[PDB]
């Protein structure tokens, strides 16, 4: 043969001059891509008289970057470290990236843009709020506190706080938001009709601090007994006195709280207003019981007009709290 024919492409290298026939005694030069590289340098061929190019032991691989697997603290994404890939990085819960988030192998097989580290997420100590005092608080790295870490506060003596008394060091190396501490005054407690009330005995009373309620006999209280200035500035409740009722039949048994009880049993010393119970009442139709429901309201309780109270002497008719029910 006269010519060498178009040289053959080896797969990450380029031919140069790359002509489809080549006269005997021109040159080639194989040389692998930037971002590869082969053993024993590139390769130069004369095409020899025979036209035949000769045996080519080229065999380009990719620069390998150095070893980038271990990310202390954190964690390194990858398939491998040759020339064309890059890599990516995140950090164990606590810990920030202190660098670039990704970095490729270069040509040159050198990391860009440069590996990263983790370092701990730390907060400066908190500031106290304008009338708090700081409860729990201790830094856990050297001044600083870290992440998730928490610090608690206490309003001063009458002061009510308004947000929450917790805050957390966060990733940004802030703080959650601080409460407020806000003084807070009450007026003093209405007295209730047939009843008394208690507070303690100075100028003026503010959050937290604590009225007592009681009845006179007869009376009980609508609402708690205690009562507390709260953070808006009127009271937790404001309870009266309520009138009792006398026990509005001699003898009957009545629901009370899901039970059956003998009234003037459980009732002996009158009902208390808002006690509830239920009469038994007589289908006389269907020869069968129900009840019908009777509230203590402020001194009144109305039976209903079904019920029929038989004095114990009438022994010969039947209770309708004895009649099986409808
Ligand atoms: C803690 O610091 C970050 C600053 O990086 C604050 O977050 C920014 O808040 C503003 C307004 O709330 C936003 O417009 C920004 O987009 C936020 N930036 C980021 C990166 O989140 C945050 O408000 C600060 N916290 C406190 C309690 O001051
Ligand atoms: C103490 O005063 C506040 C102020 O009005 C009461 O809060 C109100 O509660 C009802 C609930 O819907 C509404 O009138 C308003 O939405 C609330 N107002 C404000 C400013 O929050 C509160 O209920 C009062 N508490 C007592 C025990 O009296
Ligand atoms: C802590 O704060 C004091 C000043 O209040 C300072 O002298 C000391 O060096 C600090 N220590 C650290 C570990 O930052
Ligand atoms: C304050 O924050 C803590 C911690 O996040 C959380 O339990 C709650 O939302 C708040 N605590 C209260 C309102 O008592």
Same mark, same amino acid.
């Given at each position: 043969?006269?010519?060498? =024919?178009?040289?053959?492409?080896?797969?990450?290298?380029?031919?140069?001059?790359?002509?489809?026939?080549?006269?005997?005694?021109?040159?080639?030069?194989?040389?692998?891509?930037?971002?590869?590289?082969?053993?024993?340098?590139?390769?130069?061929?004369?095409?020899?008289?025979?036209?035949?190019?000769?045996?080519?032991?080229?065999?380009?691989?990719?620069?390998?970057?150095?070893?980038?697997?271990?990310?202390?603290?954190?964690?390194?994404?990858?398939?491998?470290?040759?020339?064309?890939?890059?890599?990516?990085?995140?950090?164990?819960?606590?810990?920030?990236?202190?660098?670039?988030?990704?970095?490729?192998?270069?040509?040159?097989?050198?990391?860009?843009?440069?590996?990263?580290?983790?370092?701990?997420?730390?907060?400066? =100590?908190?500031?106290? =709020?304008?009338?708090?005092?700081?409860?729990?608080?201790?830094?856990?790295?050297?001044?600083?506190?870290?992440?998730?870490?928490?610090?608690?506060?206490?309003?001063?003596?009458?002061?009510?706080?308004?947000?929450?008394?917790?805050?957390?060091?966060?990733?940004?190396?802030?703080?959650?938001?601080?409460?407020?501490?806000?003084?807070?005054?009450?007026?003093?407690?209405?007295?209730?009709?047939?009843?008394?009330?208690?507070?303690?005995?100075?100028?003026?009373?503010?959050?937290?601090?604590?009225?007592?309620?009681?009845?006179?006999?007869?009376?009980?209280?609508?609402?708690?007994?205690?009562?507390?200035?709260?953070?808006?500035?009127?009271?937790?409740?404001?309870?009266?006195?309520?009138?009792?009722?006398?026990?509005?039949?001699?003898?009957?048994?009545?629901?009370?709280?899901?039970?059956?009880?003998?009234?003037?049993?459980?009732?002996?010393?009158?009902?208390?207003?808002?006690?509830?119970?239920?009469?038994?009442?007589?289908?006389?139709?269907?020869?069968?019981?129900?009840?019908?429901?009777?509230?203590?309201?402020?001194?009144?309780?109305?039976?209903?007009?079904?019920?029929?109270?038989?004095?114990?002497?009438?022994?010969?008719?039947?209770?309708?709290?004895?009649?099986?029910?409808?």
């Amino acid at each position: 043969g006269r010519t060498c =024919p178009k040289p053959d492409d080896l797969p990450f290298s380029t031919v140069v001059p790359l002509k489809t026939f080549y006269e005997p005694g021109e040159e080639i030069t194989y040389s692998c891509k930037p971002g590869y590289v082969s053993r024993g340098g590139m390769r130069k061929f004369i095409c020899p008289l025979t036209g035949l190019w000769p045996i080519n032991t080229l065999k380009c691989t990719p620069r390998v970057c150095p070893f980038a697997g271990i990310l202390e603290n954190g964690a390194v994404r990858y398939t491998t470290f040759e020339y064309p890939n890059t890599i990516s990085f995140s950090c164990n819960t606590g810990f920030y990236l202190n660098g670039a988030d990704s970095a490729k192998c270069t040509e040159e097989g050198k990391w860009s843009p440069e590996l990263p580290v983790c370092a701990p997420i730390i907060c400066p =100590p908190p500031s106290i =709020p304008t009338f708090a005092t700081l409860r729990v608080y201790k830094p856990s790295a050297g001044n600083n506190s870290l992440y998730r870490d928490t610090a608690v506060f206490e309003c001063l003596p009458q002061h009510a706080m308004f947000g929450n008394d917790t805050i957390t060091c966060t990733t940004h190396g802030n703080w959650t938001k601080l409460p407020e501490c806000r003084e807070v005054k009450c007026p003093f407690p209405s007295r209730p009709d047939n009843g008394f009330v208690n507070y303690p005995a100075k100028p003026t009373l503010y959050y937290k601090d604590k009225a007592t309620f009681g009845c006179h006999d007869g009376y009980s209280l609508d609402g708690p007994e205690e009562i507390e200035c709260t953070k808006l500035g009127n009271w937790s409740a404001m309870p009266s006195c309520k009138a009792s009722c006398k026990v509005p039949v001699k003898k009957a048994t009545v629901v009370y709280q899901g039970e059956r009880v003998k009234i003037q049993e459980k009732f002996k010393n009158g009902m208390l207003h808002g006690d509830k119970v239920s009469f038994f009442c007589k289908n006389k139709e269907k020869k069968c019981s129900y009840t019908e429901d009777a509230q203590c309201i402020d001194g009144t309780i109305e039976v209903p007009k079904c019920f029929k109270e038989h004095s114990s002497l009438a022994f010969w008719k039947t209770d309708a709290s004895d009649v099986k029910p409808c």
